[PDB]
Write an enzyme that holds these catalytic residues in place. Structure first.
Site, mmCIF file in Angstrom:
data_model
loop_
_atom_site.group_PDB
_atom_site.id
_atom_site.type_symbol
_atom_site.label_atom_id
_atom_site.label_comp_id
_atom_site.label_asym_id
_atom_site.label_seq_id
_atom_site.Cartn_x
_atom_site.Cartn_y
_atom_site.Cartn_z
ATOM 1 C CG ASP A 96 0.029 15.409 11.587
ATOM 2 O OD1 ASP A 96 -0.222 16.463 10.969
ATOM 3 O OD2 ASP A 96 0.730 14.509 11.076
ATOM 4 N NE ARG A 135 -0.242 15.750 6.838
ATOM 5 C CZ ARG A 135 -0.431 17.054 7.008
ATOM 6 N NH1 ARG A 135 -0.911 17.777 6.004
ATOM 7 N NH2 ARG A 135 -0.114 17.642 8.162
ATOM 8 C CG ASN A 136 -2.366 12.273 9.423
ATOM 9 O OD1 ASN A 136 -1.714 11.397 8.837
ATOM 10 N ND2 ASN A 136 -1.795 13.279 10.055
ATOM 11 C CG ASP A 189 -0.913 10.578 13.557
ATOM 12 O OD1 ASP A 189 -0.313 10.757 12.477
ATOM 13 O OD2 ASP A 189 -0.508 11.055 14.638
ATOM 14 C CB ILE A 243 -0.957 -0.012 1.202
ATOM 15 C CG1 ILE A 243 -2.022 -1.086 0.985
ATOM 16 C CG2 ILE A 243 -1.589 1.361 1.388
ATOM 17 C CD1 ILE A 243 -2.885 -1.391 2.189
ATOM 18 N N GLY A 244 1.979 1.222 0.737
ATOM 19 C CA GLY A 244 2.924 2.329 0.750
ATOM 20 C C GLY A 244 4.236 1.992 1.442
ATOM 21 N NE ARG A 245 8.454 -1.524 -0.368
ATOM 22 C CZ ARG A 245 8.351 -2.593 0.414
ATOM 23 N NH1 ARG A 245 8.557 -2.486 1.719
ATOM 24 N NH2 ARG A 245 8.040 -3.772 -0.107
ATOM 25 N N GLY A 246 7.737 3.992 3.379
ATOM 26 C CA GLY A 246 8.396 5.196 3.853
ATOM 27 C C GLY A 246 9.785 4.881 4.376
ATOM 28 C CG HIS A 247 13.731 6.835 6.634
ATOM 29 N ND1 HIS A 247 13.936 6.941 7.993
ATOM 30 C CD2 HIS A 247 14.945 6.581 6.090
ATOM 31 C CE1 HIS A 247 15.218 6.763 8.258
ATOM 32 N NE2 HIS A 247 15.853 6.544 7.121
ATOM 33 N N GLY A 271 8.803 2.933 7.906
ATOM 34 C CA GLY A 271 7.813 1.882 7.850
ATOM 35 C C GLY A 271 7.239 1.611 6.479
ATOM 36 C CB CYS A 272 6.494 -0.654 4.351
ATOM 37 S SG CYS A 272 7.046 -2.169 5.158
ATOM 38 C CB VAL A 273 1.006 0.196 4.840
ATOM 39 C CG1 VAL A 273 -0.359 -0.385 5.218
ATOM 40 C CG2 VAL A 273 1.421 1.265 5.836
#
Ligand SMILES: O=C(Nc1ccc(F)cc1)C1(C(=O)Nc2ccc(Oc3ccnc4cc(OCCN5CCOCC5)ncc34)c(F)c2)CC1
Length: 290
Positions: A153, A157-158, A171, A33-37, A39-41
């Protein structure tokens, strides 16, 4: 291969009270679904006692070597565990595995995040629909405020949107970075959603969540425009102190803009409560036929 014994013992029981057995969860690693620095989903399938399959989102760490990151990641899940409200994202559970990252398991949200949804020109919510999304966020925040939970936050987007177009306040936390780098500026703070006093002190309250909610309403009425696009992130404080606010969107009703200006009151104590916002926006919503 985390060592549970190195973690805070209060934290670890809390996790065991919401544990998902590894054999009950199938992580579809090929379906990201998504990747970041940090974490990931992933897409996932959760089986319950009857073998009923539940479509879920599965959040993971990229590294498990730092005890602070691991603790923080688990703490994010535990913070959620008692949220039980139709407009707040719920926790399905946490999966501790013999090897690899612990996994935070969330109900799948068919329409992703609210900002991307209202920016998607292939959906066409009416003005009434958009105000309705705002009302749902207010209801979720009224619930969270009643628990003395400060979000810090709140932004389109959240917030998530499910198959029934129910808004779930949430969040992304450690996965905030998968998308959305530019809106956070040095701890990276969402400065264009932040109340004046938070910009000055980096302290957050329910009343500063109210300021953020005002910006979120502006996002809704503009169908996801970036706020203050002409303003350098580091200069938003100077800009606001000149005596400025976001302008009224073309299709924003006057009473709703008045509500935004109340949310941005220079005195935090004078901003409306989320209870008041639910009442006021319910009334404005009701004046629309469709
Ligand atoms: O939300 C959280 N805490 C929290 C904080 C305050 C609060 F009020 C409520 C919860 C935490 C959290 O990790 N939340 C979280 C929220 C959304 C997350 O991402 C998703 C969850 C469920 N469904 C999703 C669906 C999705 O996209 C769906 C597919 N899209 C759909 C749109 O178009 C393209 C394809 N993207 C992300 C999803 C996630 F992995 C974690 C930190 C625990």
């Amino acid at each position: 291969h985390i060592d549970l014994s190195a973690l805070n013992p209060e934290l670890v029981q809390a996790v065991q009270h919401v544990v998902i057995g590894p054999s009950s969860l199938i992580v579809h690693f090929n379906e990201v679904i998504g990747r970041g620095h940090f974490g990931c989903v992933y897409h996932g399938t959760l089986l319950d006692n009857d073998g009923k399959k539940i479509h879920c989102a599965v959040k993971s760490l990229n590294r498990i070597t730092d005890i602070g990151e691991v603790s923080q990641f688990l703490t994010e899940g535990i913070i959620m565990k008692d949220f039980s409200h139709p407009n707040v994202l719920s926790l399905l559970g946490i999966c501790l595995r013999s090897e690899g990252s612990p996994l935070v398991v969330l109900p799948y949200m068919k329409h992703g995040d609210l900002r991307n949804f209202i920016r998607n020109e292939t959906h066409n919510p009416t003005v009434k629909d958009l105000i309705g999304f705002g009302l749902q966020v207010a209801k979720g925040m009224k619930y969270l405020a009643s628990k003395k939970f400060v979000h810090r936050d709140l932004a389109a987007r959240n917030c998530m949107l499910d198959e029934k177009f129910t808004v779930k306040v949430a969040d992304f936390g450690l996965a905030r970075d998968m998308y959305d780098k530019e809106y956070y500026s040095v701890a990276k703070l969402p400065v264009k959603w932040m109340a004046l006093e938070s910009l000055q002190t980096q302290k957050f309250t329910t009343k500063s969540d109210v300021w953020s909610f005002g910006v979120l309403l502006w996002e809704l009425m503009t169908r996801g425009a970036p706020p203050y696009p002409d303003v350098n992130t580091f200069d938003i404080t100077v800009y606001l102190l000149q005596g400025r606010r976001l302008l009224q969107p073309e299709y924003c009703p006057d009473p709703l803009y008045e509500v935004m200006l109340k949310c941005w009151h220079p005195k935090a104590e004078m901003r409306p409560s989320f209870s008041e916002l639910v009442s006021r926006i319910s009334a404005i919503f009701s004046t629309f036929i469709g």
